Amino acid sequence: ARTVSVS
Amino acid sequence: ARTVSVS
Amino acid sequence: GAMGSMERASLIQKAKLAEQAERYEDMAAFMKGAVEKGEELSCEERNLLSVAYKNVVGGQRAAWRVLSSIEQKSNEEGSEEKGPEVREYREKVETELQGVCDTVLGLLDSHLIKEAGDAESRVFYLKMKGDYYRYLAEVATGDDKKRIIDSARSAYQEAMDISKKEMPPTNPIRLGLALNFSVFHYEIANSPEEAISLAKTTFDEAMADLHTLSEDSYKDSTLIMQLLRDNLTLWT
Amino acid sequence: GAMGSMERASLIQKAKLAEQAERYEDMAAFMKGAVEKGEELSCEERNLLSVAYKNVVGGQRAAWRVLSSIEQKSNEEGSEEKGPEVREYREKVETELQGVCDTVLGLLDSHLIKEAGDAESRVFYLKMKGDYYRYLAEVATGDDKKRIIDSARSAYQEAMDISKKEMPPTNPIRLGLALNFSVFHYEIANSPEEAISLAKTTFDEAMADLHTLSEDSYKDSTLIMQLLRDNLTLWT
Ligand SMILES: [Ca+2]
Ligand SMILES: [Ca+2]
Ligand SMILES: [Ca+2]
Ligand SMILES: [Ca+2]
Ligand SMILES: [Ca+2]
Ligand SMILES: [Ca+2]
Ligand SMILES: [Ca+2]
Ligand SMILES: [Ca+2]
Ligand SMILES: [Cl-]
Ligand SMILES: [Cl-]
């Protein structure tokens, strides 16, 4: 689990 | 399912 | 450039074909060519531009992180000297990544942003500007890291001010902007509390506006809200 | 070429780094540079060369099939005329694929194969020659399709004759050669019965030699045998 930006 | 070559 | 002799409509057609074939470098070159025709982009065309470059820079960012990690493990105590190759190759990848970011930023500056009057286009482009400065910031070390960070922040802030005045809290562009600005705070600006506050506030204001949406719009907004929730779960 | 000023050992080091970063185009350019130094390749180096180009051409083959399918659906009755873009873009991809195959075949011809004396290297290179002619055959239409097919067949046949004389039936290179030659028969040469016979015979002779192997060699051989079984299950 890591920080996500918009996909 | 399809024909496979060496991987 | 090399796409100067092709029709604008043909470039757009080929961009869609390249997307289907997962040929993102081709897709990016076609969309660059379409931008350089000088006409404003439609909503569909803006999204093609974004998809193409996101996939290109995505590959480069992932490679850079692999190589940076190897490089850092080489600079531990007890590690064996292996020569300049790791640094050299990390620099090559880094240079190519900076070249792609510079290309996107050049297109936004010449002249997508200045011609963009409607809120949906202007926020879209200003968000992109923030994102590509953020990607440059991920690899910056020297005496320009601070100026790059401030350029990212400034682009994001201007986009946020417009989005708050002109768009509903459930608008996917507004939501994606807020998500990426929160990532900026958390990973680049060393401001985790600012990141958490923005993500929470964004989520709660969207939640309270969902009642106004159709079934299809509902699905679009809640997808992005879920990404805000995922980050919050990790950060807190 | 452009890798002329880099040390052979550095090129090999960087090829391994590029593999870890999944930068296969870079990996292929590094290995091309290493080949052009003029020294024979080790077993490890041969496998790096093969991995790099297999991944590059793999991407191009997959794109070509997407585009070819779209092109064929455009040439049905009831389909709307959309202009030359699909054909043009399929041709671009096709040309780039042929350029990669031509590059590999050029390296094998100058001068990997002629310098290759041991069975393990000679069979490896002749198998590669067969594979890259087969890839060219997948996209050939005109009056050279038949000559390309015969070049593939001839390379595979020479490799098979050496492998049968010089290697055990469980040898992974021998097994992979037989697997790919059977794919040639089935998909390119329109000889499904020849494909089935070769796959079966290869499987059965390996099965009877497994008793001679260590635990690690056993695992290597049975992996490839499983691919022969998968094809046979599909073809019969
Ligand atoms: Ca025109
Ligand atoms: Ca040591
Ligand atoms: Ca640098
Ligand atoms: Ca305008
Ligand atoms: Ca030397
Ligand atoms: Ca019609
Ligand atoms: Ca052609
Ligand atoms: Ca020799
Ligand atoms: Cl390099
Ligand atoms: Cl084209």
Side-chain angles (χ1 to χ4, degrees):
Chain A
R2 291 182 178 96
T3 301
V4 293
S5 61
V6 67
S7 56
Chain B
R2 291 182 178 96
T3 301
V4 293
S5 61
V6 67
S7 56
Chain C
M3 298 299 177
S5 71
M6 200 178 314
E7 292 277 16
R8 186 180 188 280
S10 295
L11 288 160
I12 300 298
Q13 193 177 347
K14 288 184 190 179
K16 293 173 192 179
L17 292 171
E19 183 179 36
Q20 294 175 79
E22 298 177 8
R23 293 267 292 189
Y24 295 110
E25 280 199 8
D26 289 348
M27 189 185 184
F30 294 136
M31 288 310 306
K32 180 172 186 283
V35 170
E36 287 172 352
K37 298 296 176 191
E39 303 289 342
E40 292 179 37
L41 300 195
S42 72
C43 180
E44 180 170 356
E45 296 162 353
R46 288 190 300 261
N47 282 287
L48 293 168
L49 179 70
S50 175
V51 165
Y53 279 101
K54 179 150 180 47
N55 277 283
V56 172
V57 77
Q60 299 171 314
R61 291 164 71 206
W64 186 93
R65 292 188 322 253
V66 170
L67 297 174
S68 179
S69 171
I70 297 168
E71 195 184 4
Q72 280 184 351
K73 288 188 178 63
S74 82
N75 301 130
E76 287 183 352
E77 190 190 344
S79 64
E80 196 57 61
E81 175 62 65
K82 43 179 169 190
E85 291 87 357
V86 174
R87 172 187 58 76
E88 286 169 354
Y89 186 48
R90 191 270 294 152
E91 289 172 346
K92 182 192 184 287
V93 174
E94 185 173 301
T95 298
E96 291 185 4
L97 184 166
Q98 293 167 320
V100 171
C101 298
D102 288 346
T103 295
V104 171
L105 292 172
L107 294 175
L108 293 171
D109 202 52
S110 299
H111 299 274
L112 291 175
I113 288 171
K114 69 166 59 61
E115 287 303 309
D118 295 359
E120 288 68 29
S121 66
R122 199 172 178 67
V123 172
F124 184 98
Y125 293 133
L126 285 162
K127 178 190 162 295
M128 265 192 99
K129 182 177 186 183
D131 289 344
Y132 286 81
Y133 274 113
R134 168 162 64 85
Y135 304 150
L136 286 174
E138 289 173 344
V139 308
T141 52
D143 57 352
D144 268 306
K145 196 182 187 188
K146 294 176 217 303
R147 268 184 273 278
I148 293 180
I149 292 169
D150 200 58
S151 293
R153 185 191 311 280
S154 171
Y156 284 135
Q157 187 61 62
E158 185 175 354
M160 288 281 307
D161 299 338
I162 300 166
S163 72
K164 284 193 185 189
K165 281 185 189 184
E166 297 296 344
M167 284 167 185
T170 48
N171 182 288
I173 302 159
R174 179 167 174 184
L175 290 176
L177 164 61
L179 176 59
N180 284 12
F181 195 17
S182 76
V183 169
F184 169 83
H185 288 310
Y186 193 91
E187 298 284 1
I188 307 301
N190 194 31
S191 309
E193 283 174 342
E194 188 70 14
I196 292 164
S197 294
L198 175 59
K200 269 174 189 174
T201 294
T202 303
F203 184 97
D204 293 347
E205 293 174 3
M207 183 60 58
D209 194 66
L210 288 177
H211 74 273
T212 65
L213 298 188
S214 70
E215 185 176 4
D216 285 13
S217 298
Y218 182 86
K219 289 197 188 304
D220 291 338
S221 299
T222 58
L223 270 219
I224 303 171
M225 287 171 68
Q226 185 57 57
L227 301 182
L228 292 161
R229 176 53 55 194
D230 294 342
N231 283 343
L232 280 167
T233 298
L234 180 70
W235 297 346
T236 72
Chain D
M3 298 299 177
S5 71
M6 200 178 314
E7 292 277 16
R8 186 180 188 280
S10 295
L11 288 160
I12 300 298
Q13 193 177 347
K14 288 184 190 179
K16 293 173 192 179
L17 292 171
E19 183 179 36
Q20 294 175 79
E22 298 177 8
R23 293 267 292 189
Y24 295 110
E25 280 199 8
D26 289 348
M27 189 185 184
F30 294 136
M31 288 310 306
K32 180 172 186 283
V35 170
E36 287 172 352
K37 298 296 176 191
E39 303 289 342
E40 292 179 37
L41 300 195
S42 72
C43 180
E44 180 170 356
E45 296 162 353
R46 288 190 300 261
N47 282 287
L48 293 168
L49 179 70
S50 175
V51 165
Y53 279 101
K54 179 150 180 47
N55 277 283
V56 172
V57 77
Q60 299 171 314
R61 291 164 71 206
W64 186 93
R65 292 188 322 253
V66 170
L67 297 174
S68 179
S69 171
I70 297 168
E71 195 184 4
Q72 280 184 351
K73 288 188 178 63
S74 82
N75 301 130
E76 287 183 352
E77 190 190 344
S79 64
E80 196 57 61
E81 175 62 65
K82 43 179 169 190
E85 291 87 357
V86 174
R87 172 187 58 76
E88 286 169 354
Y89 186 48
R90 191 270 294 152
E91 289 172 346
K92 182 192 184 287
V93 174
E94 185 173 301
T95 298
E96 291 185 4
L97 184 166
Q98 293 167 320
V100 171
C101 298
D102 288 346
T103 295
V104 171
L105 292 172
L107 294 175
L108 293 171
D109 202 52
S110 299
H111 299 274
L112 291 175
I113 288 171
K114 69 166 59 61
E115 287 303 309
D118 295 359
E120 288 68 29
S121 66
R122 199 172 178 67
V123 172
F124 184 98
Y125 293 133
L126 285 162
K127 178 190 162 295
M128 265 192 99
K129 182 177 186 183
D131 289 344
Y132 286 81
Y133 274 113
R134 168 162 64 85
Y135 304 150
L136 286 174
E138 289 173 344
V139 308
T141 52
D143 57 352
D144 268 306
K145 196 182 187 188
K146 294 176 217 303
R147 268 184 273 278
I148 293 180
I149 292 169
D150 200 58
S151 293
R153 185 191 311 280
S154 171
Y156 284 135
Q157 187 61 62
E158 185 175 354
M160 288 281 307
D161 299 338
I162 300 166
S163 72
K164 284 193 185 189
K165 281 185 189 184
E166 297 296 344
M167 284 167 185
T170 48
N171 182 288
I173 302 159
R174 179 167 174 184
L175 290 176
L177 164 61
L179 176 59
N180 284 12
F181 195 17
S182 76
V183 169
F184 169 83
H185 288 310
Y186 193 91
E187 298 284 1
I188 307 301
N190 194 31
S191 309
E193 283 174 342
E194 188 70 14
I196 292 164
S197 294
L198 175 59
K200 269 174 189 174
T201 294
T202 303
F203 184 97
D204 293 347
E205 293 174 3
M207 183 60 58
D209 194 66
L210 288 177
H211 74 273
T212 65
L213 298 188
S214 70
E215 185 176 4
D216 285 13
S217 298
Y218 182 86
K219 289 197 188 304
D220 291 338
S221 299
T222 58
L223 270 219
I224 303 171
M225 287 171 68
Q226 185 57 57
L227 301 182
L228 292 161
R229 176 53 55 194
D230 294 342
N231 283 343
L232 280 167
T233 298
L234 180 70
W235 297 346
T236 72

